[PDB]
Write a protein that binds this ligand. Structure first.
Ligand SMILES: CCN1Cc2cc(CNC(=O)c3cnc4[n+](c3C)NC(=O)C4)ccc2NCCC1=O
Length: 164
């Protein structure tokens, strides 16, 4: 079955709760496996302790830069970047989990959770999962963003891992 993973998120040092994500390994196994392993930390690096550094209300919440914490960094379990696996899953609505990138074939570790349908990203960002539980937490994160993406609270993934 497809992995279930979790992110436990704080804002300004107080817990918001847990976001549970299904990773669609049946569609995008390489992309799912990268995210899964970055949640468990089993390769010796990953999302634990990193931040949602770019959050835009009515768009998305972006995280995963565990090296530079600002959108310039992150790395995959395979190397610094890996190819776009496919574009089969679409940005259909709130709760979609998708890879951030800097152009074609530049997936690393940065990712975003959509808070609206973002159809213009179809064919450009690899969708690889969705929120199973914790959209309330996502809406809290979203509420601490701004048009510029700068967050108004420090949003930290304090813990993360694999549920199944
Ligand atoms: C740098 C190369 N590089 C890291 C890398 C960079 C981006 C691109 N960065 C962004 O898209 C991004 C991030 N954060 C913010 N913005 C943007 C546009 N705008 C904001 O206001 C905040 C996306 C993925 C990776 N990982 C793959 C590994 C890799 O080769």
């Amino acid at each position: 079955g497809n992995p279930l993973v979790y992110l436990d998120v704080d804002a300004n040092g107080k817990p918001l709760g847990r976001v549970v994500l299904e990773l669609k390994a049946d569609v995008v196994p390489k992309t799912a496996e990268n995210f899964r392993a970055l949640c468990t930390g089993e390769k010796g690096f990953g999302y634990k302790g990193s931040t949602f550094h770019r959050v835009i209300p009515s768009f998305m919440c972006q995280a995963g830069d565990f090296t530079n914490h600002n959108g310039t960094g992150g790395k995959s379990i395979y190397g610094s970047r890996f190819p776009d696996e496919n574009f089969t899953l679409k940005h259909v609505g709130p709760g979609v989990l998708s890879m951030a990138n800097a152009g074609p074939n530049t997936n690393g570790s940065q990712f975003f959770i959509c808070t609206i349908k973002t159809d213009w990203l179809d064919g450009k960002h690899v969708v690889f999962g969705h929120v199973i539980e914790g959209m309330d937490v996502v809406k809290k994160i979203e509420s601490f963003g701004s048009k510029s993406g700068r967050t108004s609270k420090k949003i930290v993934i304090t813990d993360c891992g694999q549920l199944s």
